[PDB]
Design a binder for this molecule. Structure first.
Ligand SMILES: [Cl-]
Ligand SMILES: [Cl-]
Ligand SMILES: [Cl-]
Ligand SMILES: [Cl-]
Ligand SMILES: [Cl-]
Ligand SMILES: [Cl-]
Ligand SMILES: [Cl-]
Ligand SMILES: [Cl-]
Ligand SMILES: [Cl-]
Ligand SMILES: [Cl-]
Ligand SMILES: [Cl-]
Ligand SMILES: [Cl-]
Ligand SMILES: [Cl-]
Ligand SMILES: [Cl-]
Ligand SMILES: [Cl-]
Ligand SMILES: [Cl-]
Ligand SMILES: [Cl-]
Ligand SMILES: [Cl-]
Ligand SMILES: [Cl-]
Ligand SMILES: [Cl-]
Ligand SMILES: [Cl-]
Ligand SMILES: [Cl-]
Ligand SMILES: [Cl-]
Ligand SMILES: [Cl-]
Ligand SMILES: [Cl-]
Ligand SMILES: [Cl-]
Ligand SMILES: [Cl-]
Ligand SMILES: [Cl-]
Ligand SMILES: [Cl-]
Ligand SMILES: [Cl-]
Ligand SMILES: [Cl-]
Ligand SMILES: [Cl-]
Ligand SMILES: [Cl-]
Ligand SMILES: [Cl-]
Ligand SMILES: [Cl-]
Ligand SMILES: [Cl-]
Ligand SMILES: [Cl-]
Ligand SMILES: [Cl-]
Ligand SMILES: [Cl-]
Ligand SMILES: [Cl-]
Ligand SMILES: [Cl-]
Ligand SMILES: [Cl-]
Ligand SMILES: [Cl-]
Ligand SMILES: [Cl-]
Ligand SMILES: [Cl-]
Ligand SMILES: [Cl-]
Ligand SMILES: [Cl-]
Ligand SMILES: [Cl-]
Ligand SMILES: [Cl-]
Ligand SMILES: [Cl-]
Ligand SMILES: [Cl-]
Ligand SMILES: [Cl-]
Ligand SMILES: [Cl-]
Ligand SMILES: [Cl-]
Lengths: 216, 216, 216, 216, 216, 216
């Protein structure tokens, strides 16, 4: 990575940690925060190191390439390159492939990120990676939010854990997710809790809802 | 985090430690000191990293969002924003959402925390998180302090461990907790210890109480 | 902690280490050196972090509060506060509760410890903690030094291990402990070793005593 | 290694990590990113340390020597040495064997890498190592890309994992690999998925292909 | 410890390492190098931390106190204290108990060790500890060097391992140990190897001796 | 060690790593690179720490002393000491025993290694250690290179692993090892592979040889 702003290599355990996360948790939503955490201040080189260190899941890793390539092609389109000699003390304008690390050196990656003002190719690439990871998570989710329904003997707290887990891996803006909580959570609770929660009122908190069906 | 005052990312093992605590201990009271310890000097980014790294317990994690959102809305209310261009060498006035990390950059978070005088959004956000964690702990507590009663064969020391554990997860100011120790501890001890402890006197220490029922 | 003299947070593994010690070894005497080691240069915040990180043993942890509170009340008594505005470049006079961390900030704790001359609230609080830990160790000791007696087939070396372990958790000044070694160790050895050791002389070393009953 | 640019030895755990990778994963493709990661900024000494630390697999490790020796001989050919005394504040022109570490000191390796402009023998040697590792990976691959065929009951996602894993260890330029995905992936899917995917169109994404055979 | 020369506390893992060594290996000779390694640059405080962290083996740990106390009393005898006020920028003359850490502060320990010229109380105390550890090792050794005799079917290499292990824990100057190797090693080898080794000559190396009885 | 050039003690885990290598791998050839890696920049003190930390294998460790002593005696012979007072800002001429650490201080070891120009006693001692380790490895090797012969059903790749492992622990200059590969490898392959490899030609690569007997 680069940290306050001097360069270092990705640490054995930063890397090892990332691999064990992909081994154990596969593509659960918490993989992405974990990724962003382990990749804080990372160069494209460091970012590629993390992705390529994953053996197995090559279907998903290949989808991640396709996504990265789309974002790179879009970048090139939005940022058309200008020809000419690059002056002294200046950098070339980074292409999509320079950002993804495939056609830039570590030195150029350091040159862009440390520049005044910075050309933050680490953060621009990390965006595209996470963008593509969100697709993989959403795709590899087993369940649909419509099918989470409280069982007759199920403690309310467990149903809420199922619901909000399944909700975490859905393709929905916050407004669409707001509506699912607004509509489905109370609707698809079992007849006992369902009637209890309907009596609380339309603007009731989760804490209030969850404590309402505590003895239930 | 930020430490004496230069910025660094959350360490693999700081993060890993937090996750294992939420895995193993779920929401036992000692989770919160552990949290404050692992989050010493953390930015909102770092704070969000810790919370989002938790997969599972999404009922609780969702309650934590609701709490955070209430505190943010309250902040906005108490701190109404003033319009205008922000001058050179100055920051914008942070909103509730900038503090919670959702609408501020890492750079702005560093800008506020390092400023002269500082705008300590890390500590302001960490307050709200812990505030909301205390609710979760209190809610997820299995037992009520009224139901801790010494068994006829139970060594006094074990009863005190049950009592003060259950007391740790109660919604009570220190004065209310003072009263529970004052009243219930000796009251709900078994007839043998109960009479022993009544003979010691109303201002007797725990050490004195516990040693009084040692051979008992 | 603070170390040569700049501030840092308690490390994940410093903390984790402390917890595992309280998990595994409970309140064996070596807990206190371990504590002092893990708390070298700690602020009251750091000290509280360590104590509150312990879940379980709340009987003991509550005794530790009572002790801390007595020492704090005594401090307040010995150091009565003087009213007035605190001048520029100066600190307020720390109370008992500021030392214990409950009514002081991390900044004020750093302000006192780094001052010229220093107001070492970390070391003053660490004293009270260890003071109270010694009570817990002495209390939770299973055996009394009077009851350690060498068995007829017991190798002398094992009896000495029992003796000096039990001696380690006794409430005795060095002079009282000197006397126990002087009197009891040789007295309560078995008839064979007992007569052997009596023949060595009153000023004989442990090495000499232990090697005297080696073939015995 | 050398890092921003001062020298350090390879860390116990950097090394240990490399060994465990060669123990566990043998010569799976992800060994090479892992290698490049663990060898970021490494001197030839550090590079040799990593290779020689491997016991077992001496067939492969011997192939790696042969490859290294070919690249070194080629270097010598392309860079013929010029005789004369080396002036003050100057280095000798590195041979193939100086780059591979066998006939250069650690000091000379530091002298070349830190020079203005640098003579990056670490990166030149790391190239040859990876070059030779790619041969070993390609050689030790069990399966050929032509033989990956979806089974009648096989979920499409698993077939894609087999395909792109086997593709990762093939001797093929990106254009040749492009063609295999273009041709074989859809061709060698089972009759159900095969007809589904043919109906999508020739320019369909993996995501689209994989979701097309999700219920299939 | 103190390291190039600024003070730090003993690390969690430095300490943990020491404890695990005393747990696993008890008092095997390699404990002392391990000790010296883990105590490089340690203050008396740090040294005491290591010794007191050991629970169990209190017979041995008590012998270590007696030894330390003898060395301290001897120091006081050789270095009689001179009365008077200590001048500005000067230290008091350290007593035996100041060196052992019992009557000196951490600050005074830092004051002596960093002084110009230094008063190396860490190294003076570490001497006495190791002095006393050597007694414990020698005492707790199960076997005597006279009783190591090669068995009729025993490979020579195993007998040499027994011999030189037992030799490592003997009270003997290098000259006395030289003589044991000179005399006993070849004498107490079995009749086959014994006659072989006698034929080699009186000045034969271990390598020569060990390879002489390789097929034997 | 000493690193860019300031002194530090050997780390707990550097040491622990070395011990575990000698525990697990005994004296396999990869022990020596591992050693050189773990001893990069080590003082004689640090070097002795590593060797003495090994309990068990005292036959081998004693051979290592004999070797070290021969190299030290040779050094003394080649470097005869010159009498006189050592001037200000100058060091004494190091003897064999000063290099091996037995008659020099840590300070003098730092004085020699940091001097202008340096007297690299760490590297001079590390040479002798490795010199002696190579003898131990060669001695403790179970098999002779003449006895590695491919079995009738043995995959060629496994035979090459046996061959080049056994070759790694032989006393042979590169020219002698070149000849063994030149002669024995193809000679002692089984009749099928033997005839295949003879048809390839005298200058055929290992890769070519190994792929030639892949289907075989
Ligand atoms: Cl690391
Ligand atoms: Cl790894
Ligand atoms: Cl994986
Ligand atoms: Cl998944
Ligand atoms: Cl790759
Ligand atoms: Cl795969
Ligand atoms: Cl450029
Ligand atoms: Cl941008
Ligand atoms: Cl579900
Ligand atoms: Cl870390
Ligand atoms: Cl983690
Ligand atoms: Cl969890
Ligand atoms: Cl819980
Ligand atoms: Cl998230
Ligand atoms: Cl959940
Ligand atoms: Cl701003
Ligand atoms: Cl505030
Ligand atoms: Cl209970
Ligand atoms: Cl840590
Ligand atoms: Cl922890
Ligand atoms: Cl506990
Ligand atoms: Cl206990
Ligand atoms: Cl707390
Ligand atoms: Cl408890
Ligand atoms: Cl103040
Ligand atoms: Cl005081
Ligand atoms: Cl006992
Ligand atoms: Cl390390
Ligand atoms: Cl290792
Ligand atoms: Cl291996
Ligand atoms: Cl393989
Ligand atoms: Cl090697
Ligand atoms: Cl092998
Ligand atoms: Cl040169
Ligand atoms: Cl080049
Ligand atoms: Cl396959
Ligand atoms: Cl540590
Ligand atoms: Cl520990
Ligand atoms: Cl122990
Ligand atoms: Cl022992
Ligand atoms: Cl102690
Ligand atoms: Cl004991
Ligand atoms: Cl003084
Ligand atoms: Cl001295
Ligand atoms: Cl034996
Ligand atoms: Cl370490
Ligand atoms: Cl160790
Ligand atoms: Cl061993
Ligand atoms: Cl071996
Ligand atoms: Cl030793
Ligand atoms: Cl041995
Ligand atoms: Cl000198
Ligand atoms: Cl030399
Ligand atoms: Cl073999």
């Amino acid at each position: 990575p680069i940290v306050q702003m001097i360069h270092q290599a990705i640490s054995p355990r930063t890397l090892n940690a990332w691999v064990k996360v992909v081994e154990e948790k596969a593509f659960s939503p918490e993989v992405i925060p974990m990724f962003s955490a382990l990749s804080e201040g990372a160069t494209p080189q460091d970012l590629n190191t993390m992705l390529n260190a994953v053996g197995g899941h090559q279907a998903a890793m290949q989808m991640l390439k396709e996504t990265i390539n789309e974002e790179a092609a879009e970048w090139d389109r939005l940022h058309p390159v200008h020809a000419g000699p690059i002056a002294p003390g200046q950098m070339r304008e980074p292409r999509g492939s320079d950002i993804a690390g495939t056609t830039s050196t570590l030195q150029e990656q350091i040159g862009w990120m440390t520049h005044n003002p910075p050309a933050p190719v680490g953060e621009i690439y990390k965006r595209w990676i996470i963008l593509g990871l969100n697709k993989i998570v959403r795709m590899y989710s087993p369940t649909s939010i419509l099918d989470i329904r409280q069982g007759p003997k199920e403690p309310f707290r467990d149903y809420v854990d199922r619901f909000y887990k399944t909700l975490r891996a859905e393709q929905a803006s916050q407004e669409v997710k707001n509506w699912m909580t607004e509509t489905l959570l109370v609707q698809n609770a079992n007849p006992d809790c369902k009637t209890i929660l309907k009596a609380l009122g339309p603007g009731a908190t989760l804490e209030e809802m969850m404590t309402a069906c505590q003895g239930v």
